[PDB]
Design a binder for this molecule. Structure first.
Ligand SMILES: NC(=O)C1=CN([C@@H]2O[C@H](COP(=O)(O)OP(=O)(O)OC[C@H]3O[C@@H](n4cnc5c(N)ncnc54)[C@H](OP(=O)(O)O)[C@@H]3O)[C@@H](O)[C@H]2O)C=CC1
Ligand SMILES: NC(=O)C1=CN([C@@H]2O[C@H](COP(=O)(O)OP(=O)(O)OC[C@H]3O[C@@H](n4cnc5c(N)ncnc54)[C@H](OP(=O)(O)O)[C@@H]3O)[C@@H](O)[C@H]2O)C=CC1
Ligand SMILES: NC(=O)C1=CN([C@@H]2O[C@H](COP(=O)(O)OP(=O)(O)OC[C@H]3O[C@@H](n4cnc5c(N)ncnc54)[C@H](OP(=O)(O)O)[C@@H]3O)[C@@H](O)[C@H]2O)C=CC1
Ligand SMILES: NC(=O)C1=CN([C@@H]2O[C@H](COP(=O)(O)OP(=O)(O)OC[C@H]3O[C@@H](n4cnc5c(N)ncnc54)[C@H](OP(=O)(O)O)[C@@H]3O)[C@@H](O)[C@H]2O)C=CC1
Lengths: 460, 460, 460, 460
């Protein structure tokens, strides 16, 4: 197969999943699943399209659009849109592939997909963003629909962009339906959706802490290093604070902002809100670091990730982008006494990082190990609450915040228990060693999809 | 109308419904309903189509495919698919006609339909069945849909076939929706769907027994003769046993399997499970009749139905196919002291059998009479639960087994009460005589559909 | 296959085609075509539907509607609509089946289909026919379209009905297209469409006469017996008269009208026009007995076909309906010196008639033989000009009468020559024996369809 | 733009077009066309999809499917399908990009596209090919249509595959329409389509010879080296022979077959027919090289291209695949006295080859130069005749071979004259130097598309 193009991010995701399935008893019990893996790994459909749009000076602009419709055995294709200058098919395939198995771990009927553009929102006006969304949806509309493919947000796609997208879908197709999630509260949105992914990360990590420490520890007083400062990071930070933890770092594409005293200080909600408002306006954390409220409390480090700069730390929640925790960073976290690392970001850890965490787990009993949770398990609360937004729209009713949050919590607890129990079944650890959440999550998502695919005749 | 082809099974079903309407005060109260009867009896739409498919030897095969869309006043067309070598338009018209009124009795919004093929699953491989299903759905897909027509199983169509069919529908139409029921648990199925029809038949007969005996008797200690050994028979048997009844017979297309001591012994769940596994593989009861587990406890009667061979018996549940209880067999059941017979199978009793049971009812007060219930009342539980599977898919959520079963019990109790009350209203029996469940059920289902049709301008 | 219903007309058409294929070298050269016969003989799709409509008194009326979409390898399904109280699926399957092979002999890209209703235009008002057509098209429109299936007239369906059907299609689908043929001249009709079938029958028999006599004789001076008095019979008669022949009979469903002097007299164009006027008004030939101008010239025979009552005749053109020339009638025609018989009607001759004509051909050298042409060859002018109507509509232009007629002539000549040549190739007659136009036409049409079906993967 | 994946074939085609437009006066006159080039070079739409299909052993197989819908300003997307193990997006984008401008040079209303799969027909049975085509079209069907995108053949896709594709389209979509070209003569094909591309190459080269030699020379007695042995090569060879030229070589993926006497010997039609029959069966030229008819007349060279092995030669028609004439091969042709080289294959010459030819042209007056014609000009007769097949289908009529061939000839003459005249206008050669057909063809195709795009608002 040397006709196939090299897609480094996709291949990284694929190899990690595959290696976890091989390092288990799964293919001894179900060798025929090798065929399922070969089938599932080739997307059902991919659409690519030119997007021509007009800038504020009246000039023609060209960007590339994509939608990867990876798998639909469990439900309509489901997953977000990324507007970032790095975007290409390789990246969106990694993300769509991840999405299959993440979705499967939610318990809801959602297939896996992802899409987006190499359009860069930075430096654009709101009007440019509106015209781009209009043009993007003009092509995308024909391929999506409430029972076919339901997009959502991701890097560079917020409630603002989902609004322009939805309005154009409605104009084009003359239907009002749950074709997108992350919608506005008055026009078919769900309460808890803004909060969902970062809350779910934190909720999942609570279960990790409870298990590893036998209920002795919690987030109360733990020091938590976060990276990113967007949707996932903001609400992960807010939930940590609500639970009495201390957030010692946030970051963005230009640098890290770290409290000067990491033993005892924390970001506050008010500071997070300030950062969030800069981000709505597509500005950098750097703009506020010399203000009164920040110059004395924080150190800004241009060009750096937080991980080697936070001192001793208890929990790490990378929440920005793929491959943002290197192997050297991982070793630094381990040396700083970090015991829990969960991916808010998709594929947040490099392979070297993952290998470092899992070797540590296998070498150190119980609470002495750093315990790593992959994004498909820990960050699934966003997509889960998107499924609940679809369910609301289908019912033509709106649920309460408490009702949505309660379902989110149950979904994240079940997701943790399924990864744990599946790791014990298929990859039973040595005595006193914590089960691999990555292996167990991978096997549990994969087998549910493989078996539904078999039932549906996709492979035999 | 000597241009019309002779369709014996449909004419049989039509005539029995019509005769029960005539033998009542319905047409005195509402003579205009004769117009409704003439309209409803001609199907709204029927699709017939060639199905070409490839056998494991690479050879072209040809079979006939059908979908009868009989009536859609109360909801989208709803009803299963039968793959059996007897299948033709007459058989499928009888079935779809019955389904209109059965569906009306469930209280849910389901029109009547039925379909299938003369494709014979016996002697085929799983791969053959998969290719057939693929080819069958390539044509069927354009006629069906979650709000148009929702098929399901019947003789020869199990969850395996539903899977191949659903998978092809999704591939063709690029939508994940409630287009079929009987689906797998991870991909839109409902708990209780496997159990539903047999459970419901037994639930229904519990009401019969309570009424006729003023609560003095139940299934506990009763001897129950069942025919068939497929989905309906298996779970009717299992519920009879759960209730403390004794199952003295099952049967298949080649013979009956009867306990030697029909006064005291019963099939067990383990024995039912063994037969069920054989049926999954499309093998016959004959294969196990020499096993240890079977040879000493049962007698195999090839070519014979159970009814004359079970001795004294209390309940009969024909659960295989149409016209499987003859007038002679009805007289034998009556002489053997049988006091309850309900159809698991569609049109299970011949007209002579029904005439014998109803004459016996009219001649014998109360608990001295054998009481006959028609399939449209007793066997409605399957389609009812299929409507709940549709409800669940529209909600994008899955209900618990207890939730589904509780709804099933309520539906079967209301069905029984509607038939009893309608018979008392339109066909009031002489003092001490049980009301006619067949006449009451027929009137109740027919009037609901007729009035809805009038409201919708289908007749005036 | 004792599940299959008995369909006498369809079985008759099928058997005659199959028998001519078997009585040839076709299956020695291409034995795999027996697979193509088995596949082609099962219709791709059949739609049946209830048609509820209102009569002039305001009362609900119910009739049965049908559309048999038999084969589409060579083009969109194509074929007319019959409104006659005999209509059922058998009859429409015989028609649609015949149409596959007929359309193949035209050279145009037309698949085979046929439809209609048991609705009886006799005794209905024009308003009642309008309301019927409106209701019938309400369901039929979703199954048809300019590139899908294009209906047309047949018994009981004239340009009046085509108009009501076209208007309802336009209203429902919001499209103006070649969905029907036989349309009016100002709204997409073709010149020569009314004349087409009857003219084409006569043009075809002119080639038979030319071949049988090396050009020495023609219709000039021939005595021609016609049956029926509708679209086919009228224009056949008119073209005979134009060519110098004498039309000695016409007939309807209640009797025959025969010139008193069949050796010397003929219908005139004015007479045929008066009969046509009666038939527009759904009245009978029988009325003309009261008029001395007709009574003086003709004999009216209630309940009789013409064949045994015309004395010596040269050509017979059955042009009414199926099975209107029996074996005894065929023997009478032979004895009366008839040398040419061609079907204007579909399956106009019974199998005993065909067998008599074909035996006579095989026994009698040269011009002493009676020569039989099947409807699929001789009546193909109507559907040929319908294909030209479709071509005009796709071009958005209207051709002259001369252009259309010139094409019709070339199509009928090519049709004759194909049947002649294919018979010489696959069923080569003894020296001096005319080749079988029925065998030749059947093989020619069948091989064209079977080969296209093979190319398209319908069989292998 | 380092997010964009490296697509070497696409970039090669793009750079060559772009370099020819830059090496001219085009952007001095129309600098705004730079924006058109940036727009046009990003495809309007691309679909990729998994194709799962079953082999003759009953095993699941997976391949990748594609359709590149590059540009639709001038017409519906138009271009063939390639089934070859090298296929990927890069290759199909090169081909689809080429197709835009090729189509524009035909004068017909056809946009540009291309598609296919990495499915390898070699080693597969006809049944495997049928099942693959069925599965491929199951997804492709939703994206194509007679007014949207009309595919056709290319490497690995012959009339056989177009048949299976068409049959499945018809089955899925229930329409008979000009959705594909290269169809069978009885089911909407065009005469001259098999012949079209190789005839057109030769026709175009006739014009090259006429111009360069001032009418003094022709193909009569010229020695012509051809590569490939498929559809393009076969009919190029046959037209050369018909015109009295001598074909000294053919080839396939395993080697070259060259006449032993290249001064005076030639392939014959009978030999070409033998080779063609091997190719229908997916076999290699190697199989026949030891037969009587071949061992003495020809030398078979495994692993070699013909160009350095034919001795002195007049005309080269690479007709196999992209990048099959290297720069060293080009120098060898020049040294062997070759004066005309036209691409039957798309992008047949490497850039080094093209640069060698064009430097030779610029250094050698008139008939002393080797004159190179790009595939978009010389091989356009195939797609042109596909446009005429679309026009036939839209008219619902079939043209004669003479009519189609006459249009083909006029199209190829106009295409040559447009490339010549445009090269004289925008890239005027020095005195006595032949105009660049590559530059002129590129500019003439590009400006027609750019201007239609501007008119339609695609850029401004
Ligand atoms: N939103 C959702 O529901 C879900 C998101 N995810 C994943 O969470 C992550 C963050 O998404 P989300 O918060 O929604 O996105 P946002 O756009 O709201 O925030 C992304 C953040 O990451 C930073 N960032 C993005 N790209 C890079 C890069 N290449 N290098 C360094 N920093 C970068 C941004 O910096 P800057 O502010 O400087 O632009 C920003 O702080 C992604 O991996 C996404 O796929 C996972 C589950 C659900
Ligand atoms: N499944 C459902 O939801 C519902 C089914 N029904 C009706 O219940 C009946 C049984 O259906 P189901 O259990 O689903 O089907 P299955 O195919 O699972 O079982 C059918 C049983 O009947 C036997 N059988 C079938 N045809 C004949 C025949 N012609 N002569 C003798 N025995 C025969 C079979 O024999 P063998 O095992 O030898 O093949 C098998 O034991 C039918 O009348 C059906 O329409 C009613 C309501 C709901
Ligand atoms: N129209 C077309 O383009 C073509 C028609 N055909 C065939 O030609 C035949 C005549 O069609 P067409 O002229 O269009 O139809 P019309 O309705 O115009 O004429 C039918 C004629 O046949 C008579 N007739 C109909 N049914 C019967 C019956 N069951 N017994 C006796 N006589 C009967 C009618 O009698 P009455 O007047 O008493 O009702 C009328 O004279 C049919 O077989 C048709 O399928 C063949 C090719 C093309
Ligand atoms: N068909 C059409 O209408 C048109 C085709 N083209 C172009 O013409 C060329 C030939 O197409 P066509 O004749 O239709 O295809 P065919 O599949 O009929 O023939 C292709 C030929 O090229 C050989 N070949 C293919 N791939 C390679 C390779 N990678 N290395 C060496 N030899 C190879 C094949 O060898 P083998 O026999 O060993 O398999 C075969 O002889 C292509 O470039 C195509 O895009 C251009 C215009 C129109």
């Amino acid at each position: 197969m040397s006709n196939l193009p090299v897609e480094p991010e996709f291949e990284q995701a694929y190899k990690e999943l595959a290696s976890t399935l091989e390092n288990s008893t799964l293919f001894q019990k179900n060798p025929e699943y090798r065929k399922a893996l070969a089938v599932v790994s080739v997307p059902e459909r991919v659409i690519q399209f030119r997007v021509v749009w007009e800038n504020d000076k009246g000039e023609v602009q060209v960007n590339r659009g994509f939608r990867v419709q990876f798998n639909s055995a469990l439900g309509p294709y489901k997953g977000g849109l990324r507007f970032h200058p790095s975007v290409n098919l390789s990246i969106l395939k990694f993300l769509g592939f991840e999405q299959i198995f993440k979705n499967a771990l939610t318990g809801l009927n959602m297939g896996g997909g992802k899409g987006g553009s190499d359009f860069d929102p930075k430096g654009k006006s709101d009007s440019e963003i509106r015209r781009f969304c209009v043009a993007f949806m003009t092509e995308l509309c024909r391929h999506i629909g409430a029972d076919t493919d339901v997009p959502a947000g991701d890097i560079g796609v917020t409630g603002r962009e989902i609004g322009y997208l939805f309005g154009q879908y409605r104009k084009l197709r003359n239907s009002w339906e749950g074709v997108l999630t992350g919608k506005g509260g008055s026009w078919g949105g769900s309460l808890i959706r803004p909060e969902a992914t970062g809350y779910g990360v934190v909720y999942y990590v609570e279960h990790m802490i409870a298990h590893a420490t036998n209920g002795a520890e919690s987030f109360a007083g733990k020091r938590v290093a976060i990276s990113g400062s967007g949707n996932v990071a903001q609400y992960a930070a807010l939930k940590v604070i609500e639970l009495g933890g201390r957030v010692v770092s946030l970051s963005d594409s230009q640098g890290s902002l770290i409290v000067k005293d990491t033993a005892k200080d924390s970001f506050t909600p008010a500071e997070i809100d300030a950062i969030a408002a800069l981000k709505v306006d597509r500005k950098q954390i750097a703009e506020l670091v010399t203000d009164a409220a920040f110059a004395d409390k924080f150190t800004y480090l241009p060009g750096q990730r937080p991980w080697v700069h936070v001192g001793a730390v208890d929990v790490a929640l990378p929440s920005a982008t793929q491959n943002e925790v290197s192997g050297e960073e991982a070793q630094a976290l381990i040396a700083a006494g970090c015991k829990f690392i969960a991916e808010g970001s998709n594929m947040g850890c490099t392979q070297a990082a993952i290998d470092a965490f899992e070797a540590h787990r296998e070498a150190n009993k119980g609470a002495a190990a750093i315990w790593y949770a992959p994004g498909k398990a820990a960050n699934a609360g966003g997509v889960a609450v998107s499924g609940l937004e679809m369910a609301q729209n289908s019912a033509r009713l709106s649920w309460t915040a408490e009702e949505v949050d309660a379902r989110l919590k149950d979904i994240m607890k079940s997701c943790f228990q399924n990864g744990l129990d599946t790791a014990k079944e298929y990859a039973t650890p040595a005595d006193g060693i914590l089960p691999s959440l990555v292996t167990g999550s991978n096997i549990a998502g994969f087998t549910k999809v493989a078996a539904a695919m078999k039932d549906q005749g996709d492979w035999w």
